[PDB]
Amino acid sequence: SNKCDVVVVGGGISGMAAAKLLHDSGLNVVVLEARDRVGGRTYTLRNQKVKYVDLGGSYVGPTQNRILRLAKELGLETYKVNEVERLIHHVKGKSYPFRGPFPPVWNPITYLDHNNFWRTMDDMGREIPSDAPWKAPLAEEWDNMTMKELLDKLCWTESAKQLATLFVNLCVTAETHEVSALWFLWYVKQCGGTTRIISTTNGGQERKFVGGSGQVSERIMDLLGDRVKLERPVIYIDQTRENVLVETLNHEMYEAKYVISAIPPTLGMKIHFNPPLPMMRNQMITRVPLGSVIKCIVYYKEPFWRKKDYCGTMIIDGEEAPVAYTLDDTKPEGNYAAIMGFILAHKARKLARLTKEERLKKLCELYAKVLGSLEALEPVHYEEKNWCEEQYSGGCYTTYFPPGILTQYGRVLRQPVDRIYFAGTETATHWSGYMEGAVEAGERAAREILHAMGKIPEDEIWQSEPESVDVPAQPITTTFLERHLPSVPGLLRLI
Amino acid sequence: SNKCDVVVVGGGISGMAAAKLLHDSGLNVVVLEARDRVGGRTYTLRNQKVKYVDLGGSYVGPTQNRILRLAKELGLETYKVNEVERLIHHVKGKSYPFRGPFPPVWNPITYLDHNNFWRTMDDMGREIPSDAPWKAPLAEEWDNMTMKELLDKLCWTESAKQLATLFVNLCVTAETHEVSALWFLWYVKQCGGTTRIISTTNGGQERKFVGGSGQVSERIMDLLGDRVKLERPVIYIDQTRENVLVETLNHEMYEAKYVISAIPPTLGMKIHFNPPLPMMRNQMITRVPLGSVIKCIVYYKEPFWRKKDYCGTMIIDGEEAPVAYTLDDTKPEGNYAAIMGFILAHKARKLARLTKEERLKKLCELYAKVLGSLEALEPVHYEEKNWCEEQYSGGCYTTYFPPGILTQYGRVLRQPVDRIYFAGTETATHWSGYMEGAVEAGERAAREILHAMGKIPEDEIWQSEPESVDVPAQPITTTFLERHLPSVPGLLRLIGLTTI
Ligand SMILES: *Cc1cc2c(cc1C)nc1c(=O)[nH]c(=O)nc-1n2C[C@H](O)[C@H](O)[C@H](O)COP(=O)(O)OP(=O)(O)OC[C@H]1O[C@@H](n2cnc3c(N)ncnc32)[C@H](O)[C@@H]1O
Ligand SMILES: *Cc1cc2c(cc1C)nc1c(=O)[nH]c(=O)nc-1n2C[C@H](O)[C@H](O)[C@H](O)COP(=O)(O)OP(=O)(O)OC[C@H]1O[C@@H](n2cnc3c(N)ncnc32)[C@H](O)[C@@H]1O
Ligand SMILES: [O-]/[N+](=C\c1ccc2cccc(O)c2n1)Cc1ccccc1
Ligand SMILES: [O-]/[N+](=C\c1ccc2cccc(O)c2n1)Cc1ccccc1
């Protein structure tokens, strides 16, 4: 058996960040990676037609200081996602160009209803602790409802309900009826709220890495050399003896003092445990699916939308559109012109039966309609990735909680099992579900082990992160009117 | 590699029924079983204090003709669960003895709401095809709701909502807010409807096997000899070559023409697949958890409840009650007096924290109050089993579907993946979740392979079962008033119109 201090299961950003921290402290680490590559839910493809493209996780923004610091140390640089020109909201077959992060509403009733919906999401989130959403005062009430039920209660207009629905689908790649209200409200709150999570400028979609996000995992693998073992899916963890034994599918045996599980919670099911896991974890890892998404990038000779004062951001309502949201994927030099679109949730399941060429045609015809340009019909290249088909991801972007699961099982996610500690973006308390959360969780799980070894004190397990000098955060502001305008039922009670 | 025609993964009733049919058709089968025993979600404990006791699946009834035929062919007998004396409905801290399958209701408004609740469950059920629930006309609308949301709309009284909530918790060991309304309505309809599923006499809980249900899997193991491999958890299935390769955790390798997966759907996650599963199954097996239950059996010197004219059946409402449902578990000879109780859904999670001794104490104190009997505080013995802790079950009784899953993923549940066919009770069309469903699914998957090998025509894959001559099924009937009495909103509509 191959002996070390710590076995990290998974070479995504979380496992790699944990292995780097432990290695830098002088421990002997092995990373066991199921795939022939590192990066997990990040994947940068290179070819002459795209140069590079992020087919998985890509965007970083202000307040994501851990991923910005790790990336910067590895020698990576960011560029700004194009948002110079106007965004488009496509509603009932027509494009309404706009500026600022929220699509505007002109009907006064619809205005009140939209304003109330976003405000209520943040008002609710203020009562949900980031590190313990199950301790929200109304935790059971909110956990025993879907986001569909909450939206049915909150939204007096079909206008607000359809945009709120698009918001849920885009944020967590799942249907409003699939997900706990408590979990979704926590999810928004722990990215800093609605403005911060939906914003390009001054939010989660502000920036991409020059050369792709896959370089974070690749360059940590560079540092660690042959400590990273590719095509070693873990099948068996034995904790009955003095050292932990980890076995891979290719029959190799690893022996360590501790283990970091840096895999999506439900992919814990692929591992046979001795002794069996405690009951709550045993059932938890069956209750925590990942969402459904195809990430699709259509390439054009030029960023032609910019000539019409469109930035390439499209918010597209309605069942018929295959893609509900797009960003300009053009490289900083203005070349490799491209539109990134997501095929989300039930549409990812529905449209996966088509050919690649059939999806390209549907996307080009949608983009031609929304951008009002025949140039959208003349793509020069297409890349896509269906994350639903990934045995060692389970989906993307992240794990969602169905109704009732977070209050019953949420406590178990980070709870150590003997000498196994739990990393993965799912265990983060800030930008859980993102590359930032992957870094937070890996580093925390690594410091839990340093503390178990007596190397650091308890108060050093969770560590704050200084603000990026390169990507500083501006405050989220609200207007007097946004804060005090009544809801629709509010305006009724006042009549 | 050990060579055969068919590897069966799982030595539950489903896997063993498959293996037996294939073996009887003259094929070479191997059963790879993870545990040191067959039976899976059935488990008969034997010791001198209890003689035998079912800690997993136990009850069989009318219309479950496949498990009754299989058990009869293996030399097993049934006996009737005690329903001679009165049942008890315990609500707001008081016990109301009754007869017949449903706890009665005297308040006329409450009576209409209760009658409308059960009636509407079966009415919606008749819209849902047993073999394709996602083809129901309102499949999408029903699948996008929880059972909690459906009870909130249907029940105009708290009385009906509370009883309906207990019915869901007991039937599928899950909370109303956890389960799809479509899936639950399907689950009840594919058992023959509300009356058949809830009933002891004339329903699912009518009988048990003399000597325990574990004998079904054990006796098929006896027929199969060394073809059954215990402590062979399957870790890897390879379909990239001419024959399928099946690898176990002890590094043994099995080579076969075909595989039957006879394990709970989510436990497919414990197997590494080459090539990868198709997308829809890849994601479905992360979306289908099992329910939560502790089965608890408290033993007494005598079945003292019978002397107060209680059969031992208790339907117990309220958060404080650790157990919502009990049945007499006394042996047919009248000895090893016992009460069987289920701790359901969130209470299986909450009370798992306690010791065995603390759970025994809470159950005795509950039983003493409900039966109005201090004898209930004098147990002689206790057995229990928390199915939440089983690595190779994932829960009990069965797989439930959360909102949105049955319409998006339900169709791939028994869709073959190249040379892998799917058994297990979850893939049944009649009494899915039960031992009956395990037999139907196992025999159906076996016959799918017999068809693939050209040994039978397609019309022999699905086969009807002759009615047991030993456990005949009384039909389910309604009275004129049950069929036609209005709902509470129906009555308010009548009132509205008269008054106009
Ligand atoms: C898929 C995706 C994700 C995504 C997104 C868009 C798509 C299409 N957009 C994002 C974005 O713009 N910005 C951002 O910050 N995040 C975005 N996401 C999510 C993001 O990619 C993830 O949050 C992050 O990558 C998660 O990292 P983490 O390290 O937590 O997890 P992982 O990448 O899934 O890595 C797990 C690794 O474990 C290996 N594995 C799995 N099972 C085993 C076993 N049994 N043995 C050994 N290794 C195992 C995986 O193969 C993987 O490498
Ligand atoms: C647990 C339970 C179940 C139950 C019930 C009460 C409890 C507490 N009450 C029932 C009742 O009164 N009447 C009835 O008909 N059913 C009742 N249920 C449900 C019933 O027990 C189940 O429907 C039935 O036994 C399921 O049979 P099936 O054959 O489909 O599935 P299984 O019993 O889970 O068997 C699966 C076997 O597979 C092995 N396994 C799991 N993973 C692997 C791997 N990777 N490799 C090899 N083998 C594996 C399991 O160990 C098991 O033996
Ligand atoms: O919410 N919005 C953007 C969003 C959110 C979460 C993401 C996660 C990963 C990758 C992304 O590109 C994400 N984009 C836009 C929006 C604004 C107003 C109404 C509806 C929708
Ligand atoms: O539904 N009832 C019993 C039932 C149903 C399903 C089962 C499945 C497995 C094992 C069992 O013991 C089961 N018992 C009684 C009842 C009647 C009226 C209201 C609420 C409850």
What experiment produced this structure?
Answer: X-ray
CATH number of residue B189's parent domain:
1.10.405.10
CB B439 less than 6 A from any atom of ligand 2: no
Per the document, the length of chain A is 495
Cα A9 to ligand 1 centre (Å): 13
> Element (H or E) spanning B115, and its range?
helix B108-125
Cα A192 to ligand 2 centre (Å): 45
Cα B219 to ligand 4 centre (Å): 29
Q: Are residues B155 and B254 in the same domain?
A: no
- Sign of the alpha-carbon dihedral angle for A307, A312, A313, A319: positive
**Is the CB of A272 less than 8 angstroms away from the CB of B277?**
no
**Count of CB contacts below 8 A, A vs B?**
130
Distance (Å, whole) CA A393 – CA A69: 25
Cα B197 to ligand 3 centre (Å): 46
**Is the CB of A290 less than 8 angstroms away from the CB of B289?**
no
If you ran DSSP here, which 8-state letter would residue A393 be given? T
Among candidate residues B385, B401, B417, the one where a domain is terminated: B401
Bridge-partner residues for B328, per DSSP?
Answer: B339
Q: Are residues A57 and A128 in the same domain?
A: no
Q: Are residues A217 and A145 in the same domain?
A: no
Chain A residues within an 8 Å CB radius of B236: 235, 249
Residue nearest to atom 12 of ligand 3 (CA): A205
Distance (Å, whole) CA A268 – CA A288: 11
Distance (Å, whole) CA A10 – CA B227: 37
Q: Are residues A50 and A134 in the same domain?
A: no
- B300: tokens are 């007494």
What is the distance, to the nearest Å, from the Cα of residue A53 to the centroid of all Cα atoms in its chain? 17
**Is the CB of B391 less than 8 angstroms away from the CB of A282?**
yes
- B44: tokens are 């008969």
Residue nearest to atom 52 of ligand 1 (CA): A40
Ligand 3 binding residues, C-beta < 6 A: A 59, 102-103, 163, 166-167, 170-171, 197-198, 204-205, 315, 397
Residue with tokens 């992919």: A267
Residue nearest to atom 16 of ligand 3 (CA): A198
**Is the CB of A279 less than 8 angstroms away from the CB of B404?**
no
In a domain, B481, yes or no: no
Cα A74 to ligand 2 centre (Å): 51
**Is the CB of A389 less than 8 angstroms away from the CB of B233?**
no
**C-alpha distances in angstroms, B255 versus B27, B239, B246, B449?**
14, 10, 6, 16
If you ran DSSP here, which 8-state letter would residue B146 be given? B
Sequence letter at residue A413:
L
**C-alpha distances in angstroms, B240 versus A177, A494, B247, B274?**
38, 69, 14, 7
Q: Are residues A307 and A267 in the same domain?
A: no
**Is the CB of B175 less than 8 angstroms away from the CB of A404?**
yes
- B361: tokens are 């104490």
Domain count, chain A: 3
The atom of ligand 1 lying closest to the CA of A393 is: 34
User: What is the secondary structure of B63-88 as a DSSP string?
Assistant: T-HHHHHHHHHTT--EEE---SSEEE
Distance (Å, whole) CA A306 – CA A325: 17
Q: Are residues B101 and B128 in the same domain?
A: no
* Nearest one of A342, A335, A386 to A363, comparing CA atoms: A342
**Is the CB of B404 less than 8 angstroms away from the CB of A175?**
yes
**Ligand nearest the Cα atom of residue A160:** 3
Distance (Å, whole) CA A346 – CA B364: 49
Pairing label, strands A420-422, A258-261:
parallel
- Domain span at residue A148? 107-198
Around A250, how many Cα atoms within 13 Å sit in the side-chain half-sphere? 11
- B11: tokens are 């030595």
In a domain, A185, yes or no: yes
Residue nearest to atom 2 of ligand 4 (CA): B198
With CA atoms as reference, the chain B residue closest to A404 would be B178
CATH number of residue B52's parent domain:
3.90.660.10
Q: Are residues B127 and B203 in the same domain?
A: no
Chain B residues within an 8 Å CB radius of A347: none
In a domain, B494, yes or no: no
B397 upstream amide cis, omega within 30 of 0: yes
Chain A residues within an 8 Å CB radius of B178: 402-405
Residue partners of B355: CB distance under 8 A and separation at least 6: none
Q: Are residues B406 and B388 in the same domain?
A: no
Cα B10 to ligand 2 centre (Å): 9
The atom of ligand 4 lying closest to the CA of B200 is: 3
In a domain, A222, yes or no: yes
Q: Are residues A309 and A296 in the same domain?
A: yes
Chain A residues within an 8 Å CB radius of B134: none
Q: Are residues B204 and B311 in the same domain?
A: yes
**Is the CB of A178 less than 8 angstroms away from the CB of B402?**
yes
Bridge-partner residues for A54, per DSSP?
Answer: A44
Q: Are residues A181 and A303 in the same domain?
A: no
CB B57 less than 6 A from any atom of ligand 2: yes
At residue B87, φ and ψ (nearest 5 deg) are: -80, 165
CATH number of residue B407's parent domain:
3.50.50.60
Q: What is the largest CA-CA distance in chain B?
A: 82
SS3 A422: strand
- A444: tokens are 């925390």
CB B31 less than 6 A from any atom of ligand 2: no
In a domain, A479, yes or no: no
Distance (Å, whole) CA B325 – CA B294: 12
User: Which of A178, A269, A277 has its CB closest to that of B269?
Assistant: A269
User: What is the secondary structure of A425-465 as a DSSP string?
Assistant: GGG-SSSTTSHHHHHHHHHHHHHHHHHHTTSS-GGGSS---
Sequence letter at residue B342:
F
Q: Determine contact, residues B98/B374, Cβ cutoff 8 Å.
A: no
* Nearest one of B103, B130, B128, B129 to B117, comparing CA atoms: B103
Top residue of A283, A293, A350, A409 to mutate, by most chain B CBs within 10 Å, is: A283
Dihedral, CA of residue B476, residue B433, residue B81 and residue B87, to nearest 10: -70
Distance (Å, whole) CA A273 – CA A239: 8
In a domain, B470, yes or no: no
Q: Determine contact, residues A494/A486, Cβ cutoff 8 Å.
A: yes
Residue A463 CB coordination number (10 Å): 12
Top residue of A153, A246, A286, A290 to mutate, by most chain B CBs within 10 Å, is: A286
Residue with tokens 């500026």: A99
Instruction: Give resolution in angstroms.
Output: 2.0
With CA atoms as reference, the chain A residue closest to B286 would be A289
SS3 B97: strand
Among candidate residues A139, A169, A198, the one where a domain is terminated: A198
Residue with tokens 């490289």: A331
In a domain, B19, yes or no: yes
Pairing label, strands A338-344, A272-274:
unpaired
Among candidate residues B168, B198, B228, the one where a domain is terminated: B198
Sheet with B2-3, strands from edge to edge, namely B2-3, B253-256, B244-248, B234-238, B272-274
Task: Give helix then strand counts, H and E, for chain A.
Answer: 16, 21
If you ran DSSP here, which 8-state letter would residue B433 be given? T
In a domain, A489, yes or no: no
CB A262 less than 6 A from any atom of ligand 1: yes
Residue nearest to atom 40 of ligand 1 (CA): A10
Q: What is the largest CA-CA distance in chain A?
A: 77
Q: Are residues A298 and A384 in the same domain?
A: yes
User: What is the secondary structure of A229-253 as a DSSP string?
Assistant: EET--EEEEE-SSSSEEEEETTS-E
With CA atoms as reference, the chain A residue closest to B287 would be A289
At residue A245, φ and ψ (nearest 5 deg) are: -105, 125
